[PDB]
């Protein structure tokens, strides 16, 4: 019966919470008490990339750690040469309401998406010298929130239709559809081994998916508002989330629960972006109060601030070698910090 | 700088030129967001995205409707929002009032003005002369309301219609007047389905929106 199975859901809910409390012997704050703090992290704006005439929603770094792509509501993807500030490409978009962008690991493709519900793949290095739409991936019934390449032929897309999809770009069809979120999926992050990825939705839950099998291994629930940003730890055994409750949280994949909470009474605004450092000792988070905060991932202590933007910090990324961090804002500027 | 980094710098400067030239066109177009529940006659005003272009008095206008708790942040720098209400289906005016209240008090729409069209004022007239359906069932405060003496702008229409017509408008203005701080304004209008002045009305209201933005640039308002 519909009521009979309803109790079976709550019976297992306390059975899961029983296993989580059995495995919570100590806390990460207890173990990392006798470790040296990082001190004060003083980063300076090394570059200011200008040219976007509207607010910036997304940026992504290339794997060479020199090229990055940026998306703006003006309707254009710009590819910057961060070292020399030069623009490599300016890609006009069919729809101006872009919400995300991605950079293929090979460097051959960039992706894009927004309110048109279409993930558009662009061919960066072809003959004819220009940039062309390689493929348009239709099939989502809600807006596209985030997208990441697994390879040159496989991309993963999240959407406001409460689903995530895995696409074969050659054919143009969803290979796998991931279901289980009850709200608008807002972000995803790919594991270093690319066999798993985490999702974050507006139901205040994070879900760990299996790219191959196609199912949901784990569900993490500690937040109390929309989860806007998600990111793996470099180790691949943990990930960090940022929500509208002015709170970051660290979840352990193997312990199946939250380890640490990054909160401060002075912050009351939401978190738009999150990223880690190369070692995993720095948690960087962009906020709605115009600035970015660097956290010690192991001690829940602020280590610095990146206050150099005149509007909301929308996107944020760290280079693959850890040499720099880039921030984008609604003030239409990108800044490289080192 | 090497030989082909000067050429890279020169190519970058040509990209800046096209970006600047394309943003000049974007500055001469006014952008609108179209909003309103289904059955409101939303797609018959100017008689995931469905863009629509129209111009009036040599000014470009560019209107969007999305077919909202999250994506509404993208439309944070729009010139106005056009909210459309079926002012004749009394069963759902409460939904229209809570839908309008969420938009008005939204955190990212604090400086965006709303142009309020009340479609189906020809169907509101039939529902009030016939007398079969009354406001007072759905809104108790109707029996104690009276058309203001100063406000007598009803040309050639029945007195019973003008009271219900003005009561429905107040239910939306009082939401706007409550918490707006004067940083954004609600412009109300009445339209039936076939009013051909709807472009002029958005224009006159958008000209008032640009005037207030210009006054605040110079610390006059």
């Amino acid at each position, epitope marked *: 019966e519909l009521d009979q199975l309803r109790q079976e859901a709550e019976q297992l809910k306390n059975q899961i919470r029983d296993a989580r409390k059995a495995c919570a012997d100590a806390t990460l704050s207890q173990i990392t008490n006798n470790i040296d703090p990082v001190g004060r992290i003083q980063m300076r704006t090394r570059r200011t990339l200008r040219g976007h005439l509207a607010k910036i929603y997304a940026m992504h770094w290339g794997t060479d750690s020199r090229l990055l792509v940026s998306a703006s509501q003006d309707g254009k993807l710009i590819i910057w*040469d961060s070292y020399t500030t030069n623009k*490599v490409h300016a890609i006009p978009l069919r729809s101006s309401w872009v919400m995300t962008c991605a950079y293929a690991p090979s460097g051959n493709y960039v992706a894009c998406g927004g309110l048109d519900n279409i993930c558009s793949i662009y061919n960066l290095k072809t003959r*004819e010298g220009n940039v062309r739409v390689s493929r348009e991936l239709a099939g989502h019934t809600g807006y596209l929130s985030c997208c990441r390449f697994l390879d040159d032929n496989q991309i993963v897309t999240s959407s406001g239709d409460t689903t995530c999809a895995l696409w074969d770009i050659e054919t143009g069809q969803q290979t796998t559809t991931f279901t289980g979120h009850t709200g608008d999926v807002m972000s995803l992050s790919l594991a270093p081994d690319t066999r798993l990825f985490v999702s974050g939705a507006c139901d205040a839950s994070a879900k760990l998916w299996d790219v191959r099998e196609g199912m949901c291994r784990q569900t993490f629930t500690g937040h109390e508002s929309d989860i806007n940003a998600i990111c793996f730890f470099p180790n691949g055994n943990a990930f960090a989330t940022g929500s509208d409750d002015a709170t970051c949280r660290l979840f352990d994949l193997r312990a199946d629960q939250e380890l640490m909470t990054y909160s401060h009474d002075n912050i009351i605004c939401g978190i738009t972006s999150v990223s880690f450092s190369k070692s995993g000792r720095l948690l960087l988070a962009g906020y709605d109060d115009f600035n970015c905060n660097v956290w010690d991932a192991l001690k829940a202590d602020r280590a610095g601030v990146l206050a150099g933007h005149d509007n909301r910090v929308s996107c944020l990324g760290v280079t693959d070698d850890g040499m720099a961090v880039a921030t984008g804002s609604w003030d239409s500027f990108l800044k490289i910090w080192n | 700088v*090497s030989a*082909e980094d000067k*050429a*890279a710098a*020169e*190519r970058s400067k040509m990209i800046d030129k096209n970006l600047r030239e394309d943003g000049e066109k974007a500055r001469r177009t006014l952008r609108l967001l179209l909003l309103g529940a289904d059955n409101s006659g939303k797609s018959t005003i100017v008689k995931g995205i469905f863009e629509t272009k129209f111009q009036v008095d040599k000014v470009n206008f560019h209107m969007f409707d999305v077919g909202r708790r999250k994506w509404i942040q993208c439309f944070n720098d729009v010139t106005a929002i056009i909210f459309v209400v079926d002012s004749s289906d009394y069963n759902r005016l409460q939904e229209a009032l809570n839908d309008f209240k969420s938009i008005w008090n939204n955190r990212w729409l604090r400086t965006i003005s709303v142009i309020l069209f009340l479609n189906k004022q020809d169907l509101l007239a039939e529902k009030v002369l016939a007398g079969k359906s009354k406001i007072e069932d759905y809104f108790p405060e109707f029996a104690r309301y009276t058309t203001p003496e100063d406000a007598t702008p009803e040309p050639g229409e029945d007195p019973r219609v003008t009271r219900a017509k003005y009561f429905i408008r107040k239910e939306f203005v009082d939401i706007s007047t409550a918490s707006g701080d004067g940083r954004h304004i609600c412009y109300p209008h009445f339209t039936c389905a076939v009013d051909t002045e709807n472009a002029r009305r958005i224009f006159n209201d958008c000209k008032d929106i640009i005037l207030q933005m210009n006054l605040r640039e110079y610390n006059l308002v």
Partner: single-chain antibody
Amino acid sequence: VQLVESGGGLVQPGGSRKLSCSASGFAFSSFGMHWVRQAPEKGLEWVAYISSGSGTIYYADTVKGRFTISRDDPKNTLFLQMTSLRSEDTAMYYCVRSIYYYGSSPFDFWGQGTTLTVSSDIVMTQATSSVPVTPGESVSISCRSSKSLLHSNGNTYLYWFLQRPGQSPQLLIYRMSNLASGVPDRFSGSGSGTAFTLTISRLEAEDVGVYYCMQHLEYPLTFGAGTKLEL
């Protein structure tokens, strides 16, 4: 991608001519264009260059003052104006497209040339002038330069070209290490400043001709003498 060129013919000394090249099949307005000639039996020499947007024009000192380069971007055509023609102005004239951004490969496409028959600098040398190589054998082609092509940005600005008999030259290596698009992986390049090598492992037919090494560090652009491979 095509670059067909027209003009040519016999011109008396002191005469004048106009050489035109038309592009078809690529975004012509975003490519810089070069004129490179080779004398009837001699090597490759660089003439002129016009940037995208026509903002930068360079000439070789031999033709400076009496040669004008121009382009008509809407009509997809490149020009060269001959004035005060000389007996040293007889050559196969080639048109070359170049695009310069981070990671680009300039001098990708050369065009079939036209023949005109008119009746300091980085000197860089290919000491070997002729090499007979048996098929299937590794062969190394080397050239050196007067100064270092290694720049402060870590880019070494040396390029390798191949000219098969009766053919326009094509690019093999750009910036001394990178293979061009559509080139077998058996081609490799290496070397430090002022000492460079091109290795052809598992040599085959249709892999013979004259090999040139161009420097792109500074203008004027300099080519090598040409180390040729014969069966």
